[PDB]
Design a binder for this molecule. Structure first.
Ligand SMILES: Nc1nc2c(ncn2[C@@H]2O[C@H](COP(=O)(O)OP(=O)(O)O)[C@@H](O)[C@H]2O)c(=O)[nH]1
Ligand SMILES: Nc1nc2c(ncn2[C@@H]2O[C@H](COP(=O)(O)OP(=O)(O)O)[C@@H](O)[C@H]2O)c(=O)[nH]1
Ligand SMILES: [Mg+2]
Ligand SMILES: [Mg+2]
Lengths: 246, 246
């Protein structure tokens, strides 16, 4: 009815499948929800998918053809393209009968960013919203913050869909960490400022870069989520609905 | 002696291992050369590596512990971190006894961009040069060009190493294709110009972005290489040496 699509994008250990699971249940209180799994090499799902590409191809079976692991992943998404139109249509249909279609993407994001299947699928859905989750562990140095927010800018460019930067597993944060990440993230002044202290080509090649005063809506609002405590779920829901309007 | 390190970074089908192989042989005419393989899930190497992390861990063996393919790749680079110092030192030593250390990276670049092993290793080598190869197939639309050159900008930010944008397998190009890619790439005027024709949020969110007039050395020189004809090898060699100076 409301027909929103939310695509979770992240690398290994970001926890996006658990998030897709739990954020669904959260939504299943006030909304009809659909689950789509595009990962051909995930062992188990904590939700019940209306679409599961493992039903057509899996990485493990393909490897049992003599493919290397890197080669079976790529080859698994080559075979999916034979069922491109089907899935696009499976998805478009689901989107007509639901408030939310949650799309769980390949564990290796480059399989989604670089392969025809993921790229073309995206191109052909109406205004999908993308949520890019990062493992807060990566957030050790000041450049790490600029990168996260640049990567989300690309995903946007590559998939042509608004992309929301998010940290997940924030329940594991000491709260000092919690303190530290927000500062760099929300206080654009703080971040840029700090980037000068680096006397290095990367402290120097990395400062002119966080040009917030650029683009349009230069700065993006970073969500902090937790599958575990349902932190930030209402923000995301508010962000979905609001993207659906604008 | 000259001690240069060249790190090949690219996704599946970009051909970087074949490139690392052949560009070595090309160098093995006028130089001493070392090969380092950081990919724990590659089936076979066309070169003789002085360092091979498959000798310590492989993705396939790890999966035979009940790990999913996505989970065995990540777990393979977690175990490598136990031998971090060793490899750093293996590498630093090789770099002292050779003109060139060629570093062949994990087939999935995010394993290199997001995992501690790849990120920390990079941080700890002297001014390595990174070569980001893309499959020219991805080069279908005008935004595809901006993205390639943005991704290389990140790799730079993430790894803190100068990153050279390259197309590979250019021998497969019809020459019309060859015509088309260079125009978008080298003629900065052409590219930006074209990006306006898009009346879309992505033709609109994708134009203010290719800000060449920004950064420092805003525009980067894109190499066109071929393992097959040795196209562009002299450019790269010229680019290595020149990065070694500057
Ligand atoms: N503490 C905590 N753990 C989480 C959270 N989200 C996921 N996890 C755990 O992280 C691990 C990886 O999650 P998963 O969603 O399967 O990873 P994915 O491959 O990115 O989809 C699982 O053991 C989850 O239980 C979270 O918000 N908080
Ligand atoms: N025509 C052509 N084929 C190439 C070139 N480089 C690699 N290949 C082929 O592309 C395939 C994948 O190459 P490989 O280096 O193993 O892929 P990688 O996983 O990115 O390292 C192999 O069959 C190579 O023979 C090239 O420059 N030209
Ligand atoms: Mg998963
Ligand atoms: Mg390879």
């Amino acid at each position: 009815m409301a027909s929103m699509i939310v695509v979770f994008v992240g690398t290994a250990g970001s926890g996006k499948t658990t998030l897709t699971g739990e954020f669904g249940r959260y939504l299943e209180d006030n909304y009809k929800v659909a689950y789509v799994n595009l990962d051909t090499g995930v062992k188990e799902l904590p939700y019940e998918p209306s679409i599961d590409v493992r039903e057509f191809v899996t990485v493990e079976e393909i490897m049992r053809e003599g493919y290397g692991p890197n080669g079976a992943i790529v080859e698994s998404y080559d075979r999916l393209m034979e069922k491109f139109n089907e899935y696009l249509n499976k998805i478009l249909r689901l989107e007509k009968e639901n408030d939310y279609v949650l799309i769980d993407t390949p564990g290796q994001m480059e399989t989604f960013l670089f392969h025809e299947f993921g790229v073309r699928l995206m191109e052909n859905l109406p205004y999908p919203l993308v949520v890019y989750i990062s493992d807060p562990e990566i957030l050790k140095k000041p450049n790490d913050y600029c990168f996260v927010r640049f990567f989300a800018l690309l995903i946007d460019l590559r998939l042509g869909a608004t992309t929301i930067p998010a940290l997940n597993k924030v329940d594991l944060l000491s709260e000092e960490e919690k303190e530290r990440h927000r500062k760099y993230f929300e206080d654009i002044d703080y971040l840029t400022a700090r980037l000068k202290l680096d006397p290095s080509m990367q402290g120097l090649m990395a400062y002119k870069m966080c040009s917030m005063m650029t683009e349009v809506l230069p700065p993006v609002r970073v969500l902090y989520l937790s599958a575990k405590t349902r932190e930030g779920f209402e923000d995301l829901e508010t962000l979905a609905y609001e993207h659906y309007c604008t």
